[PDB]
Amino acid sequence: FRLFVTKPEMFGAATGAAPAHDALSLIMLTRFADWVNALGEKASSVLAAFEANSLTAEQLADAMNLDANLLLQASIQAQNHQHLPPVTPENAFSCW
Amino acid sequence: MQRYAIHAETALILCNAPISQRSYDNQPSQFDRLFNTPLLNGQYFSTGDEEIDLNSGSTGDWRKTILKRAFNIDDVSLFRLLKITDHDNKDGKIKNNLKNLSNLYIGKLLADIHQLTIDELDLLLIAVGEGKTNLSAISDKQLATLIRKLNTITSWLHTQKWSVFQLFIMTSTSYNKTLTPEIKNLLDTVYHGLQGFDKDKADLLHVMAPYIAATLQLSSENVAHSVLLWADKLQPGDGAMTAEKFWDWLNTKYTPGSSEAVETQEHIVQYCQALAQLEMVYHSTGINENAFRLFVTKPEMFGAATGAAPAHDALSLIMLTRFADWVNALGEKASSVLAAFEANSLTAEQLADAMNLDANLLLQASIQAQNHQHLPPVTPENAFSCWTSINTILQWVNVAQQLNVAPQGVSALVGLDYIQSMKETPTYAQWENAAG
Amino acid sequence: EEIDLNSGSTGDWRKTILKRAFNIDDVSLFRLLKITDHDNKDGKIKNN
Amino acid sequence: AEQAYRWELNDDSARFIKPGAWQGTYAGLLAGETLMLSLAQMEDAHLK
Amino acid sequence: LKTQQEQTQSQLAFLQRKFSNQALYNWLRGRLAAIYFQFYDLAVARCLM
Amino acid sequence: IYATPADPKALLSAAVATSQGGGKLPESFMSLWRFPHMLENARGMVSQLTQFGSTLQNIIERQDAEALNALLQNQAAELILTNLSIQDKTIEELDAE
Amino acid sequence: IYATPADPKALLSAAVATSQGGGKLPESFMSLWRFPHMLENARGMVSQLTQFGSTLQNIIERQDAEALNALLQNQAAELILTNLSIQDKTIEELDAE
Incomplete structure (x- = not known):
């Protein structure tokens, strides 16, 4: 929740914008919480690797x-198609 | 056929035979x-010299599709089925041999008959200890041992009500490198305490033990001293860390509270x-507090080789649970046996009392255990x-009480073995006494 | 005839009938003898 | 009390109070019990 | 019964996220018992003094 | 054909612990008092810090005991709505019998 | 012929106690203070050792009370999976009736 109020660009908001609290942004906080x-037990090791920029696909598939x-392969195909927030x-x- | 409720031709594949074409x-x-x-x-699939690309991200030909339909898996599990079969394969491409199709099918049957996924099979074969053996170059003797180890552990996980992913946490030797807040509290508490x-x-190891137990959620310092003493024998991680190397880093290079x-x-x-894994190993395998110290100091008392570090794979977690059961x-005479077992004064008369x-x-079970050829010999x-x-x-007691006979x-x-009969045949009277 | 009733003697057919008539193994048949006869040194008895 | 210890026994390098009694993770619940040990280590070193 | 599973998990999430959980008293016991032994060697020293 | 429903899933949640940073020692001060008179000044200063810590530990335990009881009554007020709808279907059955 | 199942077995577990060794007395020290001034120094030193022991006894009781409550909720989350499978067989019966 501190990462939401300091760096909302980590959670999908625009860079340099205040974190919104409308109904579209409360779904994102709940889907993040779910x-x-x-x-489970590997949730603290992912979020510590997610607060830094060192989260990989091999670390996430372990959790x-x-x-x-x-x-x-899901990350390769997410970069080769045209999503409106583009995955790089x-x-x-x-x-x- | 009886154990896994399969047909005779499916049980034939598990005995290192190729796929029949008759x-x-x-x-x-x-x-x-x-x-x-x-x-x-309208295309028949026949064996030949054609390549089949089995990588995770290759939309291959019609021959890869039939491998997915015959095995009921996707591209991703078919690449992992290949690595279970052939660790030596550099690329994903194989030949269309009958020997290669029978080795992909023998790896899928090991996941089917134990109700496993290819992910749950690969993580189990690492936990068994057979994670470096090829199914393409396996013999008849090593394959029956491999199925026996998969039969022993999966039926044991049903009684313990554990998943394969829960067993793999207690058997893994590769660790995560990410500094969690649960490790920051371990690095701060040990630093300000010592x-x-x-x-x-x-x-x-004794003075770290109040501060290791405070941050690994341990109820005892006797356990945490045995937690630290066991990790000095593996030297886990890429740095081969002992607890003496752990404090030399923590004294001279660590600053508490910094990012x-x-x-x-x-x-x-x-x-x-690896110390947090030890906390899971001690609480899951419900072993005694004194007997867990006997495991981490003298593993030769518990069946390991003399002068070896105590292992923590799936074969060694069964032994700790069967010891705990x-x-x-x-019951009430458990402390008098374990005190007589830590010393070498445990007798058969003291054990039969408990x-x-x-x-x-x-x-008589101890006499017959010494007169037969067990591969760890009983002396x-x-x-x-x-x-x-x-x-x-x-x-020897559990078989004699099953047959309602003596040991x-x-x-x-056992003396009526057919292979043992080739040196000395039993007469009809010796069968007649054993039938009575 | 002697009947060897020790705990570790694969005896003759007469010990087998003592196990079938009493529904016990060799080990409980040696302890049934010690309940009966404390003064018996060996396991062998007579067929009286 | 540490600076009064250093001035009576001519040891400026002496250090008994260490910056770890407050743990903001656990709200510093053993801050008083840690400093009471450090004052007891200071006086026992003073009596000797 | 799917509500009671949701309510049992809401209790189990509360027992693991409150401040006074088991992880607090593992720290409070493991730190004080290191203080309580080091304080004893100083307390028995002045019983000898 | 009749298809069986899926087995009930096991719920699980995270228990991510927190970690706040350590503090630094402030600069020392050379007072006028001697060692046996400033140690007694410091010992009564630390023995009050113990009484504040034992009081703060009591308040957190009472806070988490009242936060649980308010949770147990909001959960018991939700199960009473479902059991009162089952009783509507018991009376509707007896009007159908 | 119909064979009855075996009777339910009684579970039992071990309660093997621990035993750590006794300590030895350190070497005594001859201080400067007299007996009525070092005894009062030692009595306030031991009366703080009593307050540490009563605090440590409180923490162990709170540790074993929270370790039991975490056990009671992990056991209650396991029985709810079986009772939710019995309710699947109650609805499957009413589709078979």
Whole structure:
């Protein structure tokens, strides 16, 4: 919650903007909260790697209990298609 | 066929045989009912010299599609099925041999009959210790041992109600490098507590133990001293960290409260998460507090090799639980056996008092355990001072009480072995005495 | 005839019938002898 | 009390109070019990 | 019954996120017992003095 | 064909601990008093810091005991709405019997 | 022929106590103070050791009270999975009735 009020650009807001509190932004905080609860015991090791910019697909697939190449191929295909917030290799696992 | 409720041709693949290409009873072959039970767009799948690209991100030809339909997996699990089969494969491409299709199919059956995913199979084979062996170059003897280890552990996880992902946390040797707030509280509490430490006056492991137990959520300092003493024998992480190297970094290079990246910080996080793994190993395998110290100091008492570090794989977590289920079955006389087991003064008469058995029952089970060829051999020196030997003797009791016979009545059946008969054939009278 | 009733003697057919008539193994048959006869040194008894 | 210790025994390098009794993570609940030990280490070193 | 599972988890989340959880008293016991032994060696020293 | 429903999922939540930084020692001061008179001044100063810490530990325990009881009554006021709808279906059954 | 199942077994566990060794007395020191001034120094030194021991006894009781409550909620979260599977078999019966 401190990361939301200091760096909202980590959570999908525009750079240099105040963090909004409308109904579209309360869904994002709940889907983030349901995401960290699904990590379980490895939730603190992801959020510490998410507050810094050192979160990788191999570290996330360990906590999501997924295959390591599954989040790699999902990250490759997220960069080759035209999403309106575009997924780049810089913000692939450092923007929500 | 009886253990996993499968057909005879599926059990034939698990005995290192290739996929059959012959019809049986005007039904199609095993090769046809896997790959061609409908024909995919009128194209027959036949074995040849064609390459099949099995990488995770290659939209291959129609031959990769049939491998996905015959095995019921996607591209991602088919690349991991290849790495379980062939660790030596550099690329993803294989040949369309019958030997290669039978080795991809033998790896998928090991996940099917144990109700596992390819992810749950690969993380289990690392936890077993067979994580470096190829299914493409495996023999008949090593394959039956591999299925026996998968049969032992998965049926044990059902009684313990654990997942494969829960077992893999307690068996992993690769650690995360990310500094969590739970490790910052460990790095701060040990630093501010050991400020006036003298090396000559006190042991380092003893004075760290109040501050290690305060941040690993341990109820005891006796446990935390055994937690630290075990990690000095593995030297976990990439830095091969001992607890003596841990304080030399923490005294001279760590600043409490800072967000600054220290030089060898990632080797410290791998050490602090090996101590947190130890907290999970002690509480899950419900072992005694004194007997956990006996595991981390003298593992040769518990079946390990002499002068070796105590392992923490899936084969060693079964041994700690079967030891913990054994001391719980002793009840009020459990402390008198474990005190006689830490010394070398445990006898068969003292154990039969606590097991509520006959005194001559464990005597005859100990005599027959020494006259037969167990691969850890039971000698009169380690008959009740090694855990593998006590586990061996108690199996002679569990078979003799199953057959309602004596331990030498079980040994009469062992002497009726067909391979042992080639040196000395039993007469018809010796079968007639054993039948009575 | 002697019947060897020790705990670790795979005896003759006469010890087997003592186990079938009493529904016990060799080990409980030696302890049944010590309940009966404390003065018996060996395990062997007569077929009286 | 540390500066009065340093002035009576000519030891400016002496240090008993260390910056770790306040832990903001656990709200410093053992701040008084830590400083009471450091005052007891200071006087026991003074009596000797 | 799906509400009671949601309510049991809301209690288990409360017992792990409050300040006075088990992780507090593991720290309070492990730190004070290191103080309580070092204070004893100073307290028995003046019983000898 | 009849399809069985999925098994009930096990809920899980995170327990991410916090970590606030350590403080630094302020600059020392050379007073007028001797050692046995400033130590007794400091010992009664620290023994009051112990009584504030034992009081603050009591207040947090009473805070988390009243935050749990307010949670237990907001949960008991939610289960009473569902059990009062089941009783509507018990009376509706007896009008259908 | 119909064979009855075995009777339910009684579970039992061990309660093996621990035993750590006794300590030895350190070497005594001859101070400057007389007996009525060092005894009063020692009595206030031991009366603080009593307050540390009563505080440490309180923390262990609160540690074992919170370790039990975390056990009671992990056990209550396991019984709710079985009772939610029985309710699946109650609805499946009413679709079979």
